[PDB]
Amino acid sequence: MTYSAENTEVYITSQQLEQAVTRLAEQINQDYSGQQVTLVCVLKGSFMFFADLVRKLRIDLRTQFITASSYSLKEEYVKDKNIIIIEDIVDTGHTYHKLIEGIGKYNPKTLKFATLLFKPARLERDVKLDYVCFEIEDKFIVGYGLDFDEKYRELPYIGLIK
Amino acid sequence: TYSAENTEVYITSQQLEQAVTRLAEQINQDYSGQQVTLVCVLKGSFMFFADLVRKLRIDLRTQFITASSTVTLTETSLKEEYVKDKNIIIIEDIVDTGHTYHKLIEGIGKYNPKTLKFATLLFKPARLERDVKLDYVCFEIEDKFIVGYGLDFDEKYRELPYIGLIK
């Protein structure tokens, strides 16, 4: 019974992930200077990214958690709030338009989508991603909270399966 | 206003880092050459969990359960085949009364794991309703209202890198 990293190759390093999350936090801090934002974590895969991001935010903040299959967030938490959805990966954009439809129906003041990883191949249609840490090639990736069969979430880096 | 303004630091992000390193080295050693399924108790334990798993070096499966305080457990992502005849460690943010503790042991244990341990970042032994066997504890704390590092009040304060007291 061996550590899961030996089955993987580094694709994006943990230091590279730390610099992108810093960049993203500086950006959110600036765009929402003196305002309040509700950050929405899309479980399960965004949890590690979310844990690292929220610690570098310096604005008034509320945090909420949902899953993709929950489209569920209450109207009281959406109506007239600034929402930012925090996702691990956008591939087709099927999940995206479902989160932007099911939340946008309770009329937030603003609604933005951030993803750690974006895979532009097989994109459904027109998707507005307000924040992207990494635009990656069309590859099966694990680590930094993203799993395969409940393995690899624990890796501090984004990896390929050998 | 940033929520840090109305808090005071109680446990620093450096103290946390060091406790989580210590816990990871205990688990790495205790389970050397074994597989473990770690169960994260959402929502509060997500940040502790994110940091802990990154320092583990054993063969791992991760699973998720949500506890809401009456305690309701929801099996967010917890499947019988990663518990039955496996080594489980439950990862929790705080034990205060021990009520959630025994409901978790009962809810996971009914799938008949081979072993079942409980880890908690914080233990507040005041107002315990029962005796508990905590396998791992990062910090035994005083009876105070604490927040941060994952722990909320009405969806506030999770973002703090430290455990804070409220002013």
Ligand SMILES: [Zn+2]
């Ligand atoms: Zn996702």
Ligand SMILES: [Zn+2]
């Ligand atoms: Zn679709």
Ligand SMILES: [Zn+2]
């Ligand atoms: Zn808890």
Ligand SMILES: [Zn+2]
């Ligand atoms: Zn009880």
